[PDB]
Amino acid sequence: HYILETVNLISWVLYISALVMVTPAFQPDGGINTIHYSAASIAVFLSWFRLLLFLQRFDQVGIYVVMFLEILQTLIKVLMVFSILI
Amino acid sequence: SMGCKLVYNVLDMSAIDYAIYYKYPEAALAMVTHEERANEVMALRSDKHPCVTLALIASMPKVFEAVQDKCITKANCKKDSKSFYIKYSFAFLQCPFMASPIPLPALNTMVTHGRVELLAHPLSQKYLQMKWNSYGKYFHLANLLIYSIFLVFVTIYSSLMMNNIELEERINRTTAILFCAVVIVVYILLNSMRELIQIYQQKLHYILETVNLISWVLYISALVMVTPAFQPDGGINTIHYSAASIAVFLSWFRLLLFLQRFDQVGIYVVMFLEILQTLIKVLMVFSILIIAFGLAFYILLSKIIDPQPNHLSFSNIPMSLLRTFSMMLGELDFVGTYVNTYYRDQLKVPMTSFLILSVFMILMPILLMNLLIGLAVGDIESVRRNAQLKRLAMQVVLHTELERKLPHVWLQRVDKMELIEYPNNDDYINAELERQRRKLRDISRMLEQQHHLVRLIVQKMEIKTEAD
Amino acid sequence: AVGDIESVRRNAQLKRLAMQVVLHTELERKLPHVWLQRVDKMELIEYPNNDDYINAELERQRRKLRDISRMLEQQHHLVRLIVQKMEIKTEAD
Amino acid sequence: IAFGLAFYILLSKIIDPQPNHLSFSNIPMSLLRTFSMMLGELDFVGTYVNTYYRDQLKVPMTSFLILSVFMILMPILLMNLLIGL
Numbered sequence: 001h002y003i004l005e006t007v008n009l010i011s012w013v014l015y016i017s018a019l020v021m022v023t024p025a026f027q028p029d030g031g032i033n034t035i036h037y038s039a040a041s042i043a044v045f046l047s048w049f050r051l052l053l054f055l056q057r058f059d060q061v062g063i064y065v066v067m068f069l070e071i072l073q074t075l076i077k078v079l080m081v082f083s084i085l086i
Numbered sequence: 087s088m089g090c091k092l093v094y095n096v097l098d099m100s101a102i103d104y105a106i107y108y109k110y111p112e113a114a115l116a117m118v119t120h121e122e123r124a125n126e127v128m129a130l131r132s133d134k135h136p137c138v139t140l141a142l143i144a145s146m147p148k149v150f151e152a153v154q155d156k157c158i159t160k161a162n163c164k165k166d167s168k169s170f171y172i173k174y175s176f177a178f179l180q181c182p183f184m185a186s187p188i189p190l191p192a193l194n195t196m197v198t199h200g201r202v203e204l205l206a207h208p209l210s211q212k213y214l215q216m217k218w219n220s221y222g223k224y225f226h227l228a229n230l231l232i233y234s235i236f237l238v239f240v241t242i243y244s245s246l247m248m249n250n251i252e253l254e255e256r257i258n259r260t261t262a263i264l265f266c267a268v269v270i271v272v273y274i275l276l277n278s279m280r281e282l283i284q285i286y287q288q289k290l291h292y293i294l295e296t297v298n299l300i301s302w303v304l305y306i307s308a309l310v311m312v313t314p315a316f317q318p319d320g321g322i323n324t325i326h327y328s329a330a331s332i333a334v335f336l337s338w339f340r341l342l343l344f345l346q347r348f349d350q351v352g353i354y355v356v357m358f359l360e361i362l363q364t365l366i367k368v369l370m371v372f373s374i375l376i377i378a379f380g381l382a383f384y385i386l387l388s389k390i391i392d393p394q395p396n397h398l399s400f401s402n403i404p405m406s407l408l409r410t411f412s413m414m415l416g417e418l419d420f421v422g423t424y425v426n427t428y429y430r431d432q433l434k435v436p437m438t439s440f441l442i443l444s445v446f447m448i449l450m451p452i453l454l455m456n457l458l459i460g461l462a463v464g465d466i467e468s469v470r471r472n473a474q475l476k477r478l479a480m481q482v483v484l485h486t487e488l489e490r491k492l493p494h495v496w497l498q499r500v501d502k503m504e505l506i507e508y509p510n511n512d513d514y515i516n517a518e519l520e521r522q523r524r525k526l527r528d529i530s531r532m533l534e535q536q537h538h539l540v541r542l543i544v545q546k547m548e549i550k551t552e553a554d
Numbered sequence: 555a556v557g558d559i560e561s562v563r564r565n566a567q568l569k570r571l572a573m574q575v576v577l578h579t580e581l582e583r584k585l586p587h588v589w590l591q592r593v594d595k596m597e598l599i600e601y602p603n604n605d606d607y608i609n610a611e612l613e614r615q616r617r618k619l620r621d622i623s624r625m626l627e628q629q630h631h632l633v634r635l636i637v638q639k640m641e642i643k644t645e646a647d
Numbered sequence: 648i649a650f651g652l653a654f655y656i657l658l659s660k661i662i663d664p665q666p667n668h669l670s671f672s673n674i675p676m677s678l679l680r681t682f683s684m685m686l687g688e689l690d691f692v693g694t695y696v697n698t699y700y701r702d703q704l705k706v707p708m709t710s711f712l713i714l715s716v717f718m719i720l721m722p723i724l725l726m727n728l729l730i731g732l
């Protein structure tokens with residue numbers, strides 16, 4: 001029942017992508033590729049998106065993240081029905 | 087009616103204290119609306135209720151509806167309206183003891199409780215427009231008219247500074263731009279002698295007002311704007327263009343703060359400044375999603391070889407955060423920054439740039455812009471339900487803040503008493519279900535006293551002929 | 555999105571409290587139980603719309619009208635007994 | 648009138664006025680432009696970005712401050728007042 005949480009799967013994509021980003025600092029031939037630019041952009045986006053999941057539980061700034069993540073659950077169920085019109 | 091002494095008991099309550107605590111309206115109404123001893127009932131001092139006219143309007147306001155109806159005593163000269171005078175004796179809206187440096191104590195209490203029917207009653211309305219037509223009408227008209235002289239000399243001076251520029255650059259010091267310069271600097275000095283007396287009366291709670299800080303940025307910026315008209319080498323710089331644009335914007339934005347208090351054009355500024363307070367609390371939480379995407383587009387779109395004017399806005403971190411905020415308003419530029427650079431083989435990270443952009447379009451211009459629409463629809467239908475209270479709560483806070491500024495020796499001459507004038511339904515269902523509960527309690531007590539007597543009759547009834 | 559925001563905003567004072575209790579609920583399951591019972595104090599001493607009100611008062615008046623109806627039927631039996639066994643001599647037809 | 652006069656101060660003396668900045672050269676033309684750029688045609692990367700990197704934007708740091716406070720309240724907050732009414 002670990003896979004049903006959906007907050008843990010955000011953390012596993014974040015930790016793997018932040019390891020692929022960090023490997024050119026550990027090699028003697030510290031070369032870069034287009035897999036390291038792509039891993040750096042996924043790691044930086046998901047690091048700041050996971051900070052919003054901590055701000056649910058504060059006061060005056062916690063009710064607006066509950067509104068964000070509730071109109072996001074409806075918008076996933078309705079952009080798979082109306083991906084037929086795209 | 088036979089003169090009972092109003093005293094206290096061992097638990098230091100009075101007769102009025104039980105009628106408010108147990109909440110019997112028709113028991114309290116038999117002694118605050120008494121014909122001869124109503125004034126002695128209203129002047130009591132207690133511990134549970136230090137002032138009874140502030141305790142009625144908090145607990146049961148329909149009792150205080152009837153006390154206000156006894157204060158409008160109409161004469162009986164019904165013919166021709168020749169001596170038909172209505173006599174308004176307030177005497178209850180002013181609390182002597184509850185002494186207190188609060189200016190309008192009764193009207194400020196029926197605002198914090200939301201008693202909109204007490205505020206709209208013709209005794210409170212004639213108490214406000216007596217205080218309006220004596221001092222308050224002229225500290226509001228003269229305030230809005232000496233600001234609107236300042237607003238038209240900042241607007242004229244900016245249009246004259248743009249049409250009179252030379253060459254380093256300098257201004258042609260014309261006699262028309264000099265007369266508009268002096269009127270501005272005289273207004274700043276005369277209105278800085280008003281906001282230093284204000285700091286003495288508002289020591290260190292002056293910074294919490296947020297309307298005063300608009301006025302200090304406006305006055306400093308209108309002085310930096312006006313200095314090239316005062317120097318012999320009347321030179322200009324980019325600090326004078328920047329000060330002129332802040333002064334002209336804040337001069338017209340501060341005019342909206344005066345139009346809150348008019349009719350039919352005053353409810354729409356209350357709606358503006360209430361969906362602005364919510365939008366500041368929600369654009370600091372969701373400035374995390376602009377740092378999230380704005381740094382993601384900096385990784386992907388900054389090292390594109392031969393940077394066109396399209397991709398020149400992702401070459402910094404502060405410029406990528408302004409670009410990300412502008413492309414949730416509609417200017418996304420799909421076929422200029424992603425399509426034509428992909429087919430010229432110039433897009434650096436192809437398949438991830440179409441993934442960050444696709445997840446951008448789901449939640450920034452669709453889902454975050456629909457959060458802001460849905461918060462604004464709910465705030466407008468909350469002002470519109472409470473519209474007839476926000477007009478009355480603003481009328482009383484106008485006089486409340488104005489009493490605190492004036493000296494008290496001027497007020498008592500113009501503080502008239504006994505004015506003579508010669509010429510949804512949730513609070514109704516809950517106030518009638520509560521009335522039927524007291525009626526079924528009286529029927530149940532009358533029926534139990536009668537059931538004791540009927541049961542006594544059959545115990546002591548004489549039975550001779552119909553005996554078994 | 556307009557309908558989902560006015561559904562969170564009505565239930566705002568419950569979603570803050572339901573989140574405070576699910577914070578502690580998921581946190582108890584992670585810790586070992588031997589640490590909790592030391593800090594699980596008992597007997598703390600401290601030295602220093604209205605749809606559920608209309609439906610809870612109409613239900614209260616239904617129980618009150620049932621008591622009035624039962625008291626009135628027990629009394630109607632006794633009043634009807636009196637006229638069966640009342641002595642009538644002077645006012646007899 | 649507040650923003651339309653503020654963009655006239657900042658964007659009218661730009662040297663070599665392109666077709667972009669030719670709509671802020673009057674006061675009556677700056678009030679029509681300000682009303683059209685709350686409907687969606689804000690032109691961020693044609694009137695602010697490319698003139699900043701050609702070193703042609705006259706007052707740089709204030710033009711990005713008046714524009715940033717424009718985007719908060721004219722196309723977001725005033726257009727949401729009209730939807731909610």
